[PDB]
Amino acid sequence: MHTAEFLETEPTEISSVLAGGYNHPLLRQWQSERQLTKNMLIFPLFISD
Amino acid sequence: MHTAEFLETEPTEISSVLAGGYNHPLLRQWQSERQLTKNMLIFPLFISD
Numbered sequence: 874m875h876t877a878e879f880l881e882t883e884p885t886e887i888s889s890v891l892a893g894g895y896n897h898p899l900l901r902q903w904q905s906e907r908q909l910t911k912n913m914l915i916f917p918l919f920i921s922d
Numbered sequence: 923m924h925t926a927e928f929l930e931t932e933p934t935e936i937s938s939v940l941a942g943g944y945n946h947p948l949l950r951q952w953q954s955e956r957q958l959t960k961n962m963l964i965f966p967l968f969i970s971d
Contacts, residue, residue: 899961906956907956908959910957912951
């Protein structure tokens with residue numbers, strides 16, 4: 874039988890671990906350098922004669 | 923009489939002129955690198971036994 878093979882690995886390096894920063898809905902807001910607000914928005918108008 | 927003296931000056935250098943960027947209420951919002959939103963806020967709670 875072909876069985877599922879698993880290699881021996883080293884303990885986790887702290888430097889590898891990022892998921893602590895985006896596991897929750899509010900964190901994916903924390904992670905943004907700027908959040909979208911209403912006064913950011915400019916709407917084009919085409920004016921006819 | 924002491925009169926108000928005015929020195930002769932050079933034409934305006936464009937490099938001097940910044941006020942074009944914050945003359946209007948919405949521009950002082952434009953000028954901010956991040957705007958304050960509600961999900962930014964963390965409120966401390968002191969829990970008694």
